[PDB]
Write a protein that binds this ligand. Structure first.
Ligand SMILES: Nc1ncnc2c1ncn2[C@@H]1O[C@H](COP(=O)(O)OP(=O)(O)OP(=O)(O)O)[C@@H](O)[C@H]1O
Ligand SMILES: Nc1ncnc2c1ncn2[C@@H]1O[C@H](COP(=O)(O)OP(=O)(O)OP(=O)(O)O)[C@@H](O)[C@H]1O
Ligand SMILES: Nc1ncnc2c1ncn2[C@@H]1O[C@H](COP(=O)(O)OP(=O)(O)OP(=O)(O)O)[C@@H](O)[C@H]1O
Ligand SMILES: Nc1ncnc2c1ncn2[C@@H]1O[C@H](COP(=O)(O)OP(=O)(O)OP(=O)(O)O)[C@@H](O)[C@H]1O
Ligand SMILES: Nc1ncnc2c1ncn2[C@@H]1O[C@H](COP(=O)(O)OP(=O)(O)OP(=O)(O)O)[C@@H](O)[C@H]1O
Ligand SMILES: Nc1ncnc2c1ncn2[C@@H]1O[C@H](COP(=O)(O)OP(=O)(O)OP(=O)(O)O)[C@@H](O)[C@H]1O
Ligand SMILES: [Mg+2]
Ligand SMILES: [Mg+2]
Lengths: 53, 247, 53, 247, 247, 246, 247, 247
């Protein structure tokens, strides 16, 4: 009956997707996966990788 | 108990007896308080499906954004917050009767969605995949002039002609004057016992005004007037003086 | 500290899931093509992603 | 606690006492500030259900999009955000009285949702599949000529006859000349106790001016005038010069 | 801190001191820039609620589709997107005063959502089944003439008598000739201190010019003129030539 | 980089310099193409908020029903679809300058919504209960006559006195006849450099023709004319023939 | 391929060649069917953005209420029902050309929204706090005298000088009689190839009739006439009889 | 099935069969009841799209506020209410023929919204950022002389030149003096077959009345009158009395 942009309180049935997260890790090869892991290690102080030094 | 003491109403009752066996949708028509609910319940009672559930519904009380979800049901995960799978009204009343009061308030989208199931006879749940058969006897009622609605465009022509297989129109009470007197006494005995009043009948002068007043509310207005007269009057008989203010 | 800890846990779980999925898919592929590893080519079977899925 | 010295108010009180046993809906009409809510609460108090809830609603403050959820309740999972089941105002007032204030400000589309609950008392929740039956007495109050609204087409005719079973109209204070002097004194005393003043009564000229002035806000405006007179009073008696400048 | 020198502006102060113990709603009227908010905050400060919140609310910036949610609040699950219970401005201002600024801009449909909360003080939150009672004093300010609007029809009659218990009208600055010079000197001192200038006072010709100008913006316009004069000044005395914008 | 040679346009520059220590709102008026945006940005540049954000907002481009949401912001759960809190433009321009361009095209309903934020700087977000205080300097520009509109009744009186603490009116180009030739040379040099042409001046006839045309679009129309002349130029001097568009 | 034979058309073509190195907005004016879109697409093809998008937009088919959301876009939570971010048309045509077709039908309220974007090229989305900068070249077409509209007051003066940096006016076909016969032959060959007819040319009398007719639909009307003549032809040549539509 | 007997009807049939290979938009002008829709359906049947949908739309009956949404459709999240995507009439009739009934009653503003789609065939759905391309044959019907309407300024000239490639006119029954008897006989025998009536043919007396009686509703009213007469028929042959009863 009308086409407008409004702010209102309604009761609606809502759908939403739930897939995309952590799926990018499957396609990556081992070398790119290690590079991404290094990038994650740099930003997160609580992540460490096993070393022999 | 109901009152059917007019030839125009007696032939309607005979048509009810000749229609109650059928399994096609019925559409009732009339003014306010003519007896559409009575007609629908008599149709359901006189049919073989009397023991089957009778679900009466008010289509104007169903929110738009969930309309179909209320009428066809939904499965698990159909929308966010769907914690279970609930059946619709077409599945609640299976083998019985579905009454849709005031069928004139549906939006065009609602009319199309209802007509789809009425024609095809099968529907899918909101989040489901399997199909469900109807096995539902559909009755509808309204007081609006459906011809004017379809001519204007507020009501779909296909839906009306699909529901128009059987049509029953109760005449207004102003055309059923011979039925006015039997109705009033029927109310008079009901309320007098209900309120412990000793009123037992009308006076001759009082009955004259009953047949002379145009009843805009039809039976409901007459019942209201009789209830007021019984509640307020405290004499053996109801006189025209008491009804003068009410009428 | 708590936010970084939960992020680290999520990343470690994602890596473990990726490795498990890779192992399962590879084992299924090897099981399907069992006559290839015993007699080389000319004994390949025709298979698509739908079979493994 | 209230003054009903006028003959018309005495007759209205007699009618209120006459319908104590009944449970039919009541429609109250009048001007602004005449005492419609006083009459409604007196009707509730004199009835047999006087110990039951008296739920008063302002139908103009219920949002259009959630009218059905705030009046019938809903089941959990009926819509996104419906985390738990809730009741409605009809179940909250079950066994008691429901008062609808300023019912003339109700939109035409929202009046079609009250057609079946008022008459029968049976309804379904949102997402519920079992019928709920309640016993609620219904009182409605409006300050507009409801019959004129029906004639002009802004009020549904099928709802007026469901509501107006018993109609009570309260005359304005301009015609209740006997109640002006008492209602003043009463209010005076009340305010003379609230602010701890030494006022004891009106002079004869002040009473004459009170009787002469045509009140447009009725008892509410009388309250306001008396409160202003008491607040700024300095003396044992209220003179004409104070309330004259007030009016 | 404020200047009250004219005889008409001293009876207002006496009235403010007289109504210290009251709790009735106050309505303030007057032209633009006369000091309505100054009077409102002075009324709040000279009462027993002086240590309580003063919630100043512009009723013209509340969207009409969420109005009921702003004043009354809601509960979790009231609608889609409501994930936590939230309070309203009537519950935020409990124990203090609520100041409705520019009450004359409220639409007719938005004036009907307040009728039951101005007097009684009880309401229901959106989706709440428990009645909430608050103790709030209501001040309202407008520059219109509500008595004219009510007769015209743009303002509800039943809300004017609820809000208008004590009415205060502030005269324009052109009728407050004894306030012009003290206000001018006060503004000059304030702005000379703020801008670190070396201005001290006015010249006799400038003072004669100020007393003749028919101020339309009233005190706000006088304040703007003094600020302009201070910003562009070089000497110690402001001359008639500097106040060339008045001519 | 801007040209200010007319006697009227240098008093305005001096007045702009003299108000560098103030924080009062400014109202700029004139015709179209006179340079209100230039004056507003120069006011911002020559003040103490030089490094602070300059938010230029076209108040006629905001939808009617989301005006408050845009200007003030909202909290989570304010309405159906408010999934997270979001700031407004008064919080975005906090500590800086807000330039409400073309304030004359604002409806009376929308003028009453920003009546308390201009003088106080305090407001409530949609669905928010705490009061927010900001420090923003307001500049407004319009080609109408706000005083005449207020006298008519289509502009609110209570907003004009909140905005018009300092008022600057820019004269039309047809009266700043000392600026026409410097502006023409400036635009000619700019466009000749941009399009890589060889034009470097006007003839005497062209100069006499530029000093009599009643510029209706003012400096913008002059810029358009110079751009057309440069694009279609052939030689090294623009004759009267290339200016036949006047 | 297109036909340009008249000296005015060749002059317009030379102007298009000259302005190929610029990025100024262009305004095209003429009658109905003169070839404004042909000129716009030729300008796009001969420019430096030949491989970039050419977004042709009819500004009269955009609803008034959602005009801003179509051209600027919106963020996730701009309004009720907004679920995801979406770009406008000024961001879809970044690096290319935007062709506003029939700009003369835009109302003044809608014209006011295009002021800053045309010159600056920067804007904010609906609900976005970051300024988006784009590089789009504006072509606009209309068949109404924009100068006359501006003088009358039906077109904003602030937009004409932003759009009308370069102005092209296409003469009517009535003034291009050197361009009629080639167009007729072109359309005749095109339609003969399409419909597989056997016509090959016009008689001398037919050529005289075609050249003497004052075409009001210009090239579109000529094309329609030629198509009808080809469809209804039966002979090898289209004589004067087949052109009976012309008067 | 349809009956074409008049020489003008045969000429129209020949024209329709000749332009069967064309795809150009067709315009039809004539009075109501002459059978414009029948002609359009016959054109569709004989064309190359005989196995494609025939979508018929009454543009004058579409509400203004949603006029775009019906034609172009919309994308999800375009506005408050676009919960799911939709497709317009232009996309439903992809590959078929779209018939526009009562095109002459279209508002002057609405016509400008159909300028490009009729010619180019490309459009954007409301909220969509990709261009939709369709192939639809446009047939239009009007009840007024479109050229005179354009000369009155009530119709867009551009739309008239876009639609009017091939134009057809249908004379009313007052000029079709020969088809009346065959049409009446066909209708009578069809209704006899439908209702299994005893009727076998009209008498000589009744035939003259049809020619005597002028026709304003044309074929529609003739069919209605003949059907009503069939419902009133009780014998094998019908005299003039039954036909003369209606008029
Ligand atoms: N034949 C009848 N005999 C006795 N009472 C009757 C009869 N018909 C209807 N009534 C009375 O009608 C009243 C209710 O009216 P009803 O439900 O039939 O109205 P309605 O036509 O459906 O109204 P609306 O269309 O306005 O909703 C009952 O109290 C019932 O007693
Ligand atoms: N008989 C009475 N004795 C004392 N006070 C009375 C009497 N009648 C009315 N009042 C007073 O009149 C005032 C007006 O309020 P009331 O709610 O009665 O008015 P109303 O406009 O009819 O109501 P509403 O619009 O809220 O339904 C009340 O404060 C009440 O105390
Ligand atoms: N007596 C006074 N002494 C000093 N300043 C005053 C006085 N009266 C008014 N003012 C000044 O006048 C200015 C405007 O006053 P105010 O905000 O009350 O105006 P208003 O238009 O009536 O209010 P509002 O629109 O906010 O309800 C203020 O800056 C205030 O300082
Ligand atoms: N003194 C000047 N020196 C150089 N360029 C100038 C001068 N005055 C104006 N201009 C130029 O004139 C053009 C138009 O100016 P501007 O945008 O300020 O006009 P306006 O119509 O007042 O503004 P708006 O409508 O955007 O609020 C700009 O390109 C600007 O650079
Ligand atoms: N020089 C030309 N050579 C070939 N075809 C041409 C030429 N000029 C115009 N046409 C044709 O004329 C037809 C109509 O022209 P066009 O689409 O440009 O109209 P317009 O100027 O946009 O009209 P309106 O203002 O009615 O929208 C097109 O199909 C186009 O191909
Ligand atoms: N030549 C004909 N032969 C047979 N039936 C015809 C003929 N002309 C018209 N009719 C009948 O006329 C009836 C009504 O006319 P129709 O609706 O087709 O035309 P119209 O009045 O021009 O169109 P519209 O009603 O859509 O505006 C149709 O059902 C059709 O069967
Ligand atoms: Mg009913
Ligand atoms: Mg075009």
């Amino acid at each position: 009956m009308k086409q407008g942009l409004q702010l209102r309180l309604s009761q609606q049935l809502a759908m939403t997707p739930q897939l995309q997260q952590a799926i990018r890790l499957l396609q990556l090869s081992t070398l790119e996966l290690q590079q991404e892991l290094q990038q994650a290690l740099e930003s997160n102080p609580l992540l460490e990788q096993i070393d022999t030094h | 108990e109901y009152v059917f003491e007019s030839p125009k109403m007696k032939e309607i009752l005979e048509k009810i007896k000749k229609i109650s066996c059928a399994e096609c949708p019925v559409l009732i028509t009339g003014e306010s308080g003519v007896g559409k609910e009575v007609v629908a319940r008599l149709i359901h009672k006189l049919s073989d499906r009397s023991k089957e559930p009778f679900v009466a519904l008010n289509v104007a009380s169903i929110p738009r954004d969930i309309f179909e979800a209320e009428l066809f049901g939904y499965e698990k995960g159909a929308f966010t917050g769907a914690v279970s799978s609930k059946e619709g009204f077409f599945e609640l009343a299976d083998g019985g009767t579905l009454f849709l009061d005031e069928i004139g308030e549906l939006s065009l989208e609602a009319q199309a969605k209802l007509l789809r199931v009425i024609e095809s006879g099968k529907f899918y749940r909101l989040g489901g995949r399997k199909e469900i058969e109807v096995n539902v006897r559909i009755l509808a009622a309204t007081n609006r002039n459906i011809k004017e609605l379809v001519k204007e465009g507020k009501f779909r022509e296909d839906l009306y002609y699909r529901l128009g297989v059987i049509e029953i129109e109760i005449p207004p009470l102003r055309e059923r004057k011979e039925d006015i007197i039997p109705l009033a006494n029927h109310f008079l005995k009901k309320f007098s016992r209900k309120y412990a009043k000793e009123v037992e009948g009308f006076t001759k002068s009082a009955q004259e005004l009953l047949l002379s007043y145009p009843w805009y509310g039809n039976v409901r207005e007459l019942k209201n007037v009789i209830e007021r007269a019984v509640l307020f009057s405290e004499g053996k008989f109801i006189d025209r003086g008491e009804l003068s203010c009410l009428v | 500290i708590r936010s970084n800890l939960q992020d680290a846990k999520w990343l470690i779980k994602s890596l473990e899931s990726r490795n498990d999925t890779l192992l399962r898919v590879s084992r299924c592929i090897v099981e399907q093509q069992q006559a290839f590893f015993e007699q080389g080519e000319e004994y390949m079977k025709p298979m698509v992603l739908a079979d493994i899925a």
